[PDB]
Amino acid sequence: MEKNFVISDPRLPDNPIIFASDSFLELTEYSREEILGRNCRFLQGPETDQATVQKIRDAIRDQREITVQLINYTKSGKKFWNLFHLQPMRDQKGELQYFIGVQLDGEFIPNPLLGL
Numbered sequence: 859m860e861k862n863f864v865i866s867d868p869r870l871p872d873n874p875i876i877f878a879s880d881s882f883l884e885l886t887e888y889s890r891e892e893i894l895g896r897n898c899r900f901l902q903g904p905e906t907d908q909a910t911v912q913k914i915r916d917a918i919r920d921q922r923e924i925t926v927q928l929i930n931y932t933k934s935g936k937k938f939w940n941l942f943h944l945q946p947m948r949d950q951k952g953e954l955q956y957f958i959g960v961q962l963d964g965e966f967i968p969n970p971l972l973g974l
């Protein structure tokens with residue numbers, strides 16, 4: 859199965875990407891070397907809804923799963939709608955270890971309804 863995903867380590871400064879799937883490289887047009895150690899916010903740009911970014915920030919703070927649809931940008935500046943799902947990953951002792959973030963590319967929710 860095709861799997862667009864990244865794993866971050868929230869126990870390192872500003873939650874850097876420590877793994878990015880081949881399909882994530884293909885979707886975003888970035889190389890692995892350009893992604894590893896970055897916060898995944900680099901995909902955001904002018905058209906990204908800051909209210910949606912806020913919902914992600916709160917979900918990371920509270921270590922809760924969330925799904926949002928937001929505008930992201932490829933390396934070459936191509937806009938794409940990202941249906942983005944965040945999942946906290948805890949160790950055997952219930953301590954946060956990682957976040958996994960899975961991307962689906964497409965305007966799943968029409969922008970007229972998303973804007974409501």
Ligand SMILES: Cc1cc2nc3c(=O)[nH]c(=O)nc-3n(C[C@H](O)[C@H](O)[C@H](O)COP(=O)(O)O)c2cc1C
Binds near residue numbers: 898901957958
């Ligand atoms: C595992 C993981 C994957 C993420 N993937 C994306 C993504 O694909 N697109 C995006 O805009 N933000 C993504 N983020 C969110 C940003 O990294 C950041 O948490 C968000 O923009 C809110 O924080 P900020 O307000 O400090 O930027 C991801 C976060 C995590 C932990």
